[PDB]
Amino acid sequence: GPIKVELPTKETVEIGIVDYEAGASHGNPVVDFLKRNGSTLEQKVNLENPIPIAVLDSYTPSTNEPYARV
């Protein structure tokens, strides 16, 4: 994969490529190194408290044929 560097404008630009190839192995050393030395960026950001939206009732049809046919 690519390696990117953050800029003063917070835009990241590619500066190199990760390139690991190995035969028989018990693990991936690249991912272990990055886990132990870096931090993982997570896109999803949790609210401090979930906001309930609704609790709804639904029913399954009495025959599965129409869904199969469509």
Partner: protein, 48 residues
């Protein structure tokens, strides 16, 4: 009164503080770099 200089020519080294600090940092850096690289190579071996 007699004044004996038992300094072994150290007075002829200019900017002595900076020179000795440079020597010390050279050594410390070499030691730390080597230790860190060795630890990481060992861990990579242990995972692969």
């Amino acid at each position: 009164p007699v004044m004996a200089d038992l300094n072994g020519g150290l007075q002829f080294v200019p900017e002595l503080k900076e020179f000795t600090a440079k020597l010390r940092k050279e050594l410390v850096e070499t030691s730390e770099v080597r230790k860190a690289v060795s630890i990481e190579t060992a861990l990579e071996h242990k995972v692969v």
